Design a protein around this motif. Structure first.
Motif, short mmCIF file in Angstrom:
data_model
loop_
_atom_site.label_atom_id
_atom_site.label_comp_id
_atom_site.label_asym_id
_atom_site.label_seq_id
_atom_site.Cartn_x
_atom_site.Cartn_y
_atom_site.Cartn_z
N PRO A 107 0.75 -1.24 0.00
CA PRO A 107 0.00 0.00 0.00
C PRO A 107 0.79 1.30 0.00
O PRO A 107 1.81 1.42 0.68
CB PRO A 107 -0.87 -0.03 1.28
N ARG A 108 0.23 2.30 -0.67
CA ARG A 108 0.76 3.67 -0.53
C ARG A 108 -0.41 4.61 -0.20
O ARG A 108 -1.44 4.69 -0.91
CB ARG A 108 1.59 4.20 -1.68
N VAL A 109 -0.27 5.36 0.89
CA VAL A 109 -1.35 6.28 1.28
C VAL A 109 -0.87 7.69 1.57
O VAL A 109 0.31 7.99 1.80
CB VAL A 109 -2.05 5.76 2.56
N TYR A 110 -1.82 8.63 1.58
CA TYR A 110 -1.57 10.02 1.89
C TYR A 110 -2.44 10.44 3.09
O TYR A 110 -3.48 9.81 3.30
CB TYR A 110 -1.92 11.00 0.75
N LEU A 111 -2.01 11.46 3.83
CA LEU A 111 -2.79 11.92 4.96
C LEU A 111 -3.84 12.96 4.51
O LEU A 111 -3.43 13.98 3.94
CB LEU A 111 -1.95 12.58 6.05
N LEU A 112 -5.10 12.74 4.88
CA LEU A 112 -6.09 13.76 4.50
C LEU A 112 -6.39 14.64 5.70
O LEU A 112 -6.20 14.15 6.83
CB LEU A 112 -7.39 13.13 4.05
N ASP A 113 -6.84 15.86 5.44
CA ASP A 113 -7.18 16.75 6.56
C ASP A 113 -8.47 16.23 7.18
O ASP A 113 -9.02 15.22 6.70
CB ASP A 113 -7.30 18.21 6.18
N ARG A 118 -9.40 17.33 1.33
CA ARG A 118 -8.11 17.96 0.91
C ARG A 118 -7.00 17.29 1.66
O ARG A 118 -7.22 16.71 2.74
CB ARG A 118 -8.41 19.43 1.15
N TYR A 119 -5.79 17.27 1.08
CA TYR A 119 -4.67 16.66 1.78
C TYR A 119 -4.26 17.51 2.97
O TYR A 119 -4.34 18.75 2.89
CB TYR A 119 -3.47 16.45 0.84
N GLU A 120 -3.79 16.87 4.06
CA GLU A 120 -3.26 17.75 5.13
C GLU A 120 -2.02 18.46 4.56
O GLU A 120 -1.19 17.80 3.90
CB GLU A 120 -2.89 16.88 6.32
N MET A 121 -1.87 19.76 4.80
CA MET A 121 -0.72 20.48 4.27
C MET A 121 0.31 20.75 5.37
O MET A 121 0.10 21.56 6.26
CB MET A 121 -1.12 21.73 3.49
N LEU A 122 1.48 20.11 5.29
CA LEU A 122 2.46 20.31 6.34
C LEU A 122 3.38 21.46 5.95
O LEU A 122 3.80 21.50 4.81
CB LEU A 122 3.22 19.02 6.66
N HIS A 123 3.68 22.35 6.89
CA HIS A 123 4.58 23.47 6.60
C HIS A 123 5.72 23.28 7.60
O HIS A 123 5.59 23.72 8.75
CB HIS A 123 3.88 24.83 6.72
N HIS A 152 -0.64 18.92 -4.96
CA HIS A 152 -1.68 19.96 -4.81
C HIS A 152 -2.69 19.57 -3.75
O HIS A 152 -3.10 18.41 -3.59
CB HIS A 152 -2.23 19.90 -6.22
N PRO A 153 -3.14 20.53 -2.95
CA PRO A 153 -4.02 20.34 -1.82
C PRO A 153 -5.32 19.64 -2.06
O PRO A 153 -5.73 18.89 -1.16
CB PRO A 153 -4.28 21.74 -1.19
N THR A 154 -5.99 19.78 -3.20
CA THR A 154 -7.23 19.06 -3.41
C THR A 154 -7.02 17.84 -4.32
O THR A 154 -7.98 17.18 -4.75
CB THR A 154 -8.30 19.95 -4.08
N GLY A 155 -5.77 17.59 -4.70
CA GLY A 155 -5.52 16.49 -5.63
C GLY A 155 -5.75 17.01 -7.05
O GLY A 155 -5.96 16.20 -7.96
N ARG A 338 5.99 26.31 1.40
CA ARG A 338 4.78 26.31 0.57
C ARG A 338 3.76 25.29 1.10
O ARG A 338 2.56 25.56 1.09
CB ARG A 338 5.10 25.99 -0.90
N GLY A 339 4.25 24.13 1.57
CA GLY A 339 3.30 23.16 2.14
C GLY A 339 3.43 21.85 1.37
O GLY A 339 3.57 21.84 0.14
N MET A 340 3.46 20.75 2.11
CA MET A 340 3.67 19.47 1.43
C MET A 340 2.70 18.46 1.99
O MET A 340 2.05 18.71 3.02
CB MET A 340 5.18 19.17 1.51
N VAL A 341 2.47 17.42 1.18
CA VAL A 341 1.58 16.33 1.54
C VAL A 341 2.36 15.14 2.07
O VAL A 341 3.42 14.75 1.53
CB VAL A 341 0.82 15.87 0.29
N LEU A 342 1.80 14.52 3.12
CA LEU A 342 2.40 13.34 3.71
C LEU A 342 1.96 12.03 3.03
O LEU A 342 0.75 11.74 2.94
CB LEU A 342 2.07 13.26 5.22
#
Ligand SMILES: *[C@@H]1O[C@H](CO)[C@@H](O)[C@H](O)[C@H]1NC(C)=O
Length: 402
Positions: A107-113, A118-123, A152-155, A338-342
């Protein structure tokens, strides 16, 4: 591709935001699988078959253009993540490479807010990111990863990609790989998906690697031809940081003789240190195990500048030429601002056996030890668990006992 009728049910994960003055306070987040892990099939009446393999454009019959591909290719929702080796429990995320029945979901996953849209945006520039991990079940050849990509934040949700981050669209990384869909849209011209990438953690129980990878473009970049290749817009190699590659062999491994004993769980702390103007200068990795802070090792290699942190001089001296050219540490830090996705994943490499991760100069694994057929003899069900994801102020995500 067009969401179908099967519903998406996202596992919930509790994570934390930490301050010195406030401690670590709980936050609700959700987990999403990559869009391309979802079942994608042709629409009604279009014949059997899918809409492309990894590495290629979508099939020319059903995807002559984006509009067509958006209506002819259906992304089914995944209603039960446990069928993909993905389960959560309070603050723990468990990823199974191989299930009890032998399937290999990897599996590969991303963190959502908290909204799921929207993806959680880490700064992270000027801040730290921490997590606890149990890497006991990752032999030679396995790669458990936890990293950041400038997705991108909303994919990139849009008219032909209504699924967005809710269906895991928009993956990119520093390898500029060609996927059948990019930003949820048929990748008609077979471009690669590029973006800055900070590899916080790439490891198994034998070796741990850290690596920032710069690109000279902000956010997702669609490359063609030589823009996707070694000399292109993104740094494929990254500025690697592995104790073994800097000649410190007793720092990390299975056993009492290593400072970080991978036979037991441990905490991983990563600090993105900046000047007073806010530009990233140093990346600092250290660990916490059995109540004690394990400071980073210092490089112990001829021709390598004596240091205990990642920085420009270290990167440049270790031959990270693309890293420096495409923005260097300051550039990596501007993406982190700028902000990145996990992203979190677990996988093996049939071609190369993950040799760069834990073999030769990178570790103790012998040649052929990391082949998938040997991995399963050492550990038939490789897995990883990430717990207590937490981030915020320098000095606040971890504690030492005395
Ligand atoms: C690697 O470390 C050992 C032990 O400190 C040292 O003797 C050797 O010179 C080092 N190798 C290089 C190439 O620096």
């Amino acid at each position: 591709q067009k969401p179908g009728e099967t519903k998406e049910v996202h596992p919930q994960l509790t994570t934390f935001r930490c301050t010195k003055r406030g401690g670590c306070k709980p936050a609700t987040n959700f987990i999403v699988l990559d869009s391309l892990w979802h079942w994608i099939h042709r629409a009604e009446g279009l014949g059997p078959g899918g809409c492309g393999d990894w590495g290629n454009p979508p099939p020319k019959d059903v995807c002559p253009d984006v509009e067509s591909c958006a209506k002819n290719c259906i992304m089914e929702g995944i209603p039960d993540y446990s069928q993909y080796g993905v389960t959560t429990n309070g603050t723990s995320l468990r990823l199974q490479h191989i299930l009890p029945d032998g399937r290999v979901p990897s599996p590969r996953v991303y963190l959502l807010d908290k909204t799921k849209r929207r993806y959680e945006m880490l700064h992270l520039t000027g801040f730290e990111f921490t997590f606890d991990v149990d890497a006991t079940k990752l032999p030679c050849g396995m790669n458990s990863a936890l990293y950041l990509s400038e997705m991108h934040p909303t994919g990139a949700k849009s008219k032909y990609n209504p699924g967005g981050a809710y269906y895991g669209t928009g993956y990119c990384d520093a390898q500029c790989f060609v996927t059948p869909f990019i930003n949820g849209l048929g990748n008609i011209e077979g471009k690669g998906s590029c973006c800055n990438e900070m590899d916080i953690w790439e490891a198994n129980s034998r070796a741990s690697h850290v690596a920032p990878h710069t690109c000279n473009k902000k956010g997702l970049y669609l490359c063609e031809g030589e823009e996707c290749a070694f000399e292109g817009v993104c740094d494929k190699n990254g500025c690697g940081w592995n104790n073994y590659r800097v000649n410190v062999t007793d720092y990390y491994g299975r056993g009492e003789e290593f400072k970080v004993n991978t036979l037991k769980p441990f905490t991983v702390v990563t600090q993105f240190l900046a000047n007073r103007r806010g530009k990233l200068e140093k990346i600092h990795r250290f660990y916490v195990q059995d109540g004690k802070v394990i400071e980073s090792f210092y490089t112990n290699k001829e021709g390598v500048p004596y240091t205990n942190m990642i920085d420009d001089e270290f990167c440049e001296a270790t031959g990270s030429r693309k890293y420096m050219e495409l923005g260097a540490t300051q550039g990596m830090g501007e993406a982190l601002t700028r902000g990145m996705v996990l992203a979190m994943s677990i996988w093996w490499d049939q071609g190369g056996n993950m040799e760069w991760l834990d073999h030769g100069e990178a570790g103790p694994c012998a040649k052929g030890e990391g082949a998938p057929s040997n991995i399963v003899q050492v550990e038939p069900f490789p897995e990883v668990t990430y717990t207590n994801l937490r981030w915020g102020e320098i000095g606040s995500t971890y504690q030492e006992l005395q």
